[PDB]
Amino acid sequence: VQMRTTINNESPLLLSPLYGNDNGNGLWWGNTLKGAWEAIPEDVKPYAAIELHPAKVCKPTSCIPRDTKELREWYVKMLEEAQSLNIPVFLVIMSAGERNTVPPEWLDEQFQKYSVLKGVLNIANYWIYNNQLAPHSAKYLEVCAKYGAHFIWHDHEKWFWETIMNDPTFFEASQKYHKNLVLATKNTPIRDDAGTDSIVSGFWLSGLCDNWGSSTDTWKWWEKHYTNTFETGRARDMRSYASEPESMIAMEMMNVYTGGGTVYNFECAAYTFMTNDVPTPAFTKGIIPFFRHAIQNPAPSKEEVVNRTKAVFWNGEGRISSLNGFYQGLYSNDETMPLYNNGRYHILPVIHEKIDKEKISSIFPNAKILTKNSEELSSKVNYLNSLYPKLYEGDGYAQRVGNSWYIYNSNANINKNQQVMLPMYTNNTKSLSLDLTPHTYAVVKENPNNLHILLNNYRTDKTAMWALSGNFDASKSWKKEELELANWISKNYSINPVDNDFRTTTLTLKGHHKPQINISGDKNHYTYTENWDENTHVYTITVNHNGMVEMKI
């Protein structure tokens, strides 16, 4: 049987979601299925699909997909529409602990009838676990395998993912149907961000799923009580989901990309995608440009991630969920938030207890296997620092990935610059330094005879949205105040983005022949000054921008 979707490092997947309305044309936020697909640029379409979440169609509770006549109707309606239009779709069929979801038999028939049906999703259960979720997912996975489809599970937290793969049924099914399984994060609940990345990517490395990825959720900004960028002392509301910086969304994608991840999904869609069929700047200027990077430059393969791995942590003698300060002093000071401070260790993989130590030895023959009882954990940093050499100076985030540097400012909501000094691996230049404002990422690729630099610091000013009168409390989600916000978005944010405030990225090449540069970027959204020191051979470019800037040097 041929797969319905090709998903790997050379062929990643972007999911863009649609939400059921129990009313009207059947979809929330003024969106249409046709409008959704039209929003996907043509070069992205071969690597994209639409998620169909029943949402308000679910009864008694919105977004909890209990099997009803009305739910099945809605799935069928949307499938019908998707087919006539040839739009690849995935259905959210599991969510929030629901034990009584659509029968496996029914899904099986939908697969027979619709070649646009590429697979299904289980999303968000960490707060409402029961022992039927893993077995039910296993059964659904088995149906997906029968039809060359994918089962995609977005969930979070260390104890939860440990618990899921400890299930006999799900563990046996993952071992058989890994080709059809995508395990994926969902950092909504502002806990365990590092641990989750380790365990989930760890599953992919252990052969339990052929692909991993993420749901990058801007609701986390609301969970933190954050409001306007850098603002404190204001009450949160739904505008908080519309306030995580655009480029930061891309930085969260970068965490996945550089860890070998391959599937990208997002909430809240009113911010991250589209309202009234008008794509947002977060989508077009945040998510799209980074997904395009992932298309043009395949993510680290499984063998690449394995071969760079100097140590793994194995849950076989005590679990990472019982080590609450493990990532401190390594690469995350704050597991409530997604950004990593250090790229020195990549994502350290965590291997689930169900994987024998001997199997770990054969996946990572040159890796050190750490456990909770490891003597070396009395000097955790010093020990890991003797296996993973220091690669750069400064306080910013940088990771070496093959012949590339992946860089960002790691301050989520604090207006402070970070600097990195990057030794280089070719004689194009001796070192490269960056000064970076918050919400700026960079990719430096060393070719044999040139360097390619991508910069993106796109962040709209959210002040105008925050200045609006009205009630936008989260208790009004799925209600008309949410639509008011969604309408405002399509007339203000999405069409007149307040993105004319530039910020400075400073790029210095030391020991670089006077560089002739080729430069481009987002139209009307950058200026630059060059400076060359004849005697010291230092070349400095000062880029003022709000958006993407690309150079070849």
Ligand X SMILES: CC(=O)N[C@@H]1[C@@H](O[C@@H]2O[C@@H](C)[C@@H](O)[C@@H](O)[C@@H]2O)[C@H](O[C@@H]2O[C@H](CO)[C@H](O)[C@H](O)[C@H]2O[C@@H]2O[C@@H](C)[C@@H](O)[C@@H](O)[C@@H]2O)[C@@H](CO)O[C@H]1O
Cβ atoms within 10 Å, residue 534: 7
Q: If you ran DSSP here, which 8-state letter would residue 395 be given?
A: S
- Provide, rounded to whole angstroms, the least separation between the CB of residue 219 and ligand X: 4
User: Can you say whether residue 470 is alpha, beta or left, with left for phi > 0 and alpha for psi between -120 and 50 degrees?
Assistant: left
Binding mask 257-296 for ligand X (x = CB under 6 A): ----------x-----------------------------
Task: Report the nearest approach of ligand X to the CB of residue 334 (Å).
Answer: 17
Q: Does 64 bind ligand X (CB under 6 A)?
A: yes
Which range touches ligand X (CB under 6 A), out of 59-67, 302-310, 353-361, 431-439?
A: 59-67
Identified binder of ligand X from the candidate list 33, 63, 144, 485, rule CB under 6 A: 63
Strands 350-351 vs 503-510: parallel, antiparallel or unpaired: unpaired
Closer CB to ligand X, 272 or 505, in the complex? 272
Residue closer to ligand X by CB (options 111, 222) is 222
62 binds ligand X (CB under 6 A): yes
DSSP 11: B
Among 197, 223, 237, 435, binds ligand X (CB under 6 A): 223
Closer to ligand X at the Cβ: 219 or 466?
219
Q: Which of 198, 371, 477, 494 binds ligand X (CB under 6 A)?
A: 477
Query: Smallest distance, Å, CB 489 to ligand X?
Result: 16
Q: Select the span of 66-74, 217-225, 252-260, 507-515 touching ligand X (CB under 6 A).
A: 217-225
Report the residue number, 126 or 458, with the smaller CB distance to ligand X: 126
Dist. CA 518–CA 500, nearest whole Å: 23
Q: How far apart are CA 453 and CA 11, in angstroms?
A: 23
Q: How far is the CB of 474 from ligand X (least distance, A)?
A: 6
Closest contact distance (angstroms) between CB of 8 and ligand X is 25
How many CA atoms lie less than 13 Å away from 131 in the CB half-sphere?
3
Span near ligand X by CB under 6 A; candidates 7-15, 218-226, 291-299, 439-447: 218-226
3 state DSSP class of 35: helix
Of 74, 111, 219, 406, which one interacts with ligand X (CB under 6 A)? Answer: 219
Helices (H), 395-551: 463-466, 480-491
User: Is residue 222 at the binding interface for ligand X, with CB under 6 A as the rule?
Assistant: yes
Give the whole-angstrom CA distance, residue 386 versus residue 356: 26
- Return d(Cα 146, Cα 142) in angstroms, integer: 6
The 3-class SS string of 120-184 reads EEEECCCCCCCCCHHHHHHHHHHHHHHCCCEEEEECCCHHHHHHHHCCHHHHHHHHHHHHHEEEE
Sites for ligand X among residues 84-123 (CB under 6 A): 95-96, 123
**507 in Cβ contact with 526 (< 8 Å):** no
Is residue 476 close enough to count as binding ligand X by CB under 6 A?
no
Query: Exactly one of 26, 189, 195, 281 binds ligand X (CB under 6 A); which one?
Result: 189
Burial class (CB in 10 A: 0-12, 13-18, 19+), 430: middle
Q: Which of 80, 99, 127, 379 binds ligand X (CB under 6 A)?
A: 127
CB of 63 to ligand X, least distance (A): 4
At 90, phi and psi to the nearest 5? -125, 140
Render 430-443 in DSSP notation, one character per residue: SEEEEEE-TT-EEE
Rounded Cα gap, residues 34 and 87, in angstroms: 8
| Stretch of 6-14, 60-68, 374-382, 394-402 lying at the interface with ligand X (CB under 6 A) | 60-68
State yes or no: residue 553 binds ligand X (CB under 6 A).
Answer: no
Query: Between residues 58 and 205, which has the closer beta carbon with respect to ligand X?
Result: 58
Binding stretches for ligand X (CB under 6 A): 61-64, 95-96, 123-124, 127, 188-189, 219, 222-223, 267, 477
